[PDB]
Amino acid sequence: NLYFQSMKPWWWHLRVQELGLSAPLTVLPTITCGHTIEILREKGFDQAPVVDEAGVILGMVTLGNMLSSLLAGKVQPSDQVGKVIYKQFKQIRLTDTLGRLSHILEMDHFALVVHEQQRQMVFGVVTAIDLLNFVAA
Amino acid sequence: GVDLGTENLYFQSMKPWWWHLRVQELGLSAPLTVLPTITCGHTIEILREKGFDQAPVVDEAGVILGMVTLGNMLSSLLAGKVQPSDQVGKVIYKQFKQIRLTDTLGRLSHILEMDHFALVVHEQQRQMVFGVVTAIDLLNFVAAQE
Ligand SMILES: C[S@@+](CC[C@H](N)C(=O)[O-])C[C@H]1O[C@@H](n2cnc3c(N)ncnc32)[C@H](O)[C@@H]1O
Ligand SMILES: C[S@@+](CC[C@H](N)C(=O)[O-])C[C@H]1O[C@@H](n2cnc3c(N)ncnc32)[C@H](O)[C@@H]1O
């Protein structure tokens, strides 16, 4: 067996917490899909966590998944967004590396950034521009 | 499984009422384009400020050279093909789809299912950018109409 280890850039072992992410915009499962589309349109976000009234993360709503579900005849604009909760997305820790982040971002369009306290807490969303801006700046 | 089976069997009668409407129902934004001589770092700043994931790269006459995308910029940076001071001309992406205002929303839907965007070109002048179109443009139309 032969192994290869790449030479890593300066930022590789720096941590997700260096990016300076804001708190996420989240939605309740009971607002409509149409209302969620306006919110996401206003902000220029492709996704948001869906959280219940007790603060539990139920999953993510994404534009891709809303579009698929609409095409499949399964959701309409006036339905609750709870109907299109996407439950399989990637998580990363606030103290995980930018290297790990970069792997996730190459395969997925976002990750939910998590931090461990007495329970596992959501810190924010992270997407390619957050990493790009950091490296560029 | 069974749902895919149903959607395949009745694909024709499950086509949305708007399937054969045209992309021009969407009324898009004016496009933000860049020349190939601005840097990758400045491209990243511009796209960050607007909240766009992609822009057309055009020449001094407005002729489309291709697209710059965040995903391809990231890959190119990871592979060491460019650094931020390099011209964005070094990462012109060409494997995207162009469509016209007269193309159906159905054609657009197929494209958006696989890619993050399409480039809308001028109906009789396919070398010029009309606008960019992404999922939220189609979603916004359907929510408006329903
Ligand atoms: C403006 S959006 C542009 C589109 C991009 N594909 C996206 O969805 O992030 C990019 C910026 O918004 C942030 N962002 C995305 N979704 C978020 C949300 N639900 N809450 C707060 N920030 C979010 C990203 O972390 C990034 O800083
Ligand atoms: C604010 S962005 C949000 C993130 C989304 N993933 C994207 O890149 O379009 C969505 C809106 O910006 C528009 N848009 C995207 N790229 C653009 C560009 N280069 N010039 C003008 N509008 C653009 C889209 O057509 C859509 O109306």
Author numbering:
A (entry chain A): -7 to -1, 406 to 515, 526 to 545
B (entry chain B): -14 to -1, 406 to 515, 526 to 547
Please give me the paper's original passages concerning this structure.
Cystathionine β-synthase (CBS,3 EC 4.2.1.22) plays an important role in methionine and sulfur metabolism, and is a unique heme and pyridoxal 5′-phosphate (PLP)-containing enzyme. Its canonical role is the condensation of serine and l-homocysteine (Hcy) to form cystathionine, which can be further metabolized to cysteine or glutathione. CBS adopts a three-domain structure encompassing the N-terminal heme binding, central catalytic, and C-terminal regulatory domains. In mammals, the activity of CBS catalytic domain is increased up to 5-fold by the binding of S-adenosyl-l-methionine (AdoMet) to the regulatory domain, an ∼140-amino acid stretch harboring a tandem module (CBS-1, CBS-2, collectively known as the Bateman motif) found in a number of proteins.
To this end, we constructed the hCBS regulatory domain (aa 406–547) as a standalone N-terminal His6-tagged protein, with the aa 516–525 loop either removed (hCBS-RDΔ516–525) or intact (hCBS-RD), for structural studies. Only hCBS-RDΔ516–525, but not hCBS-RD, was soluble and yielded crystals in the presence of AdoMet, diffracting to 1.7 Å resolution. To our surprise, the structure of AdoMet co-crystallized hCBS-RDΔ516–525 could not be solved by molecular replacement using an AdoMet-free regulatory domain model extracted from our hCBS-FLΔ516–525 structure, but instead by single-wavelength anomalous dispersion with a mercury-derivatized crystal. The hCBS-RDΔ516–525 crystal asymmetric unit contains a “head-to-tail” dimer mediated by a two-fold non-crystallographic symmetry (Cα-r.m.s.d. of 0.241 Å between the two subunits). There is unambiguous electron density for one AdoMet molecule per regulatory domain, bound at the cleft between CBS-1 and CBS-2 modules (inset). Although the topologies of CBS-1 and CBS-2 modules are largely unchanged between the two structures, AdoMet binding is accompanied by an ∼33° rotational rearrangement between CBS-1 and CBS-2, mediated by a bending of the inter-module linkers (aa 422–423, 480–487) that act as the hinge. Relative to CBS-2, the secondary structure elements of CBS-1 (strands β12-β13, helices α18 and α19) are displaced by as much as 8 Å from their AdoMet-free positions, thereby translocating residues (e.g. Phe443-Asp444-Gln445, FDQ motif) into bonding distances with the ligand. The AdoMet pocket in hCBS, occupying the S2 site, is formed on one side by the 443FDQ445 motif in CBS-1, on the other side by the 532GVVTAID538 motif in CBS-2, and at its end by the CBS-1→CBS-2 linker region (aa 414–423). The FDQ motif contributes an aromatic stacking interaction with the AdoMet adenine ring (Phe443), as well as hydrogen bonds with the methionyl nitrogen (Asp444) and carboxyl (Gln445) groups. The GVVTAID motif, highly conserved among CBS module-containing proteins, contributes a bifurcated hydrogen bond to the AdoMet ribosyl oxygens (Asp538) and a hydrogen bond to the methionyl carboxyl (Thr535).
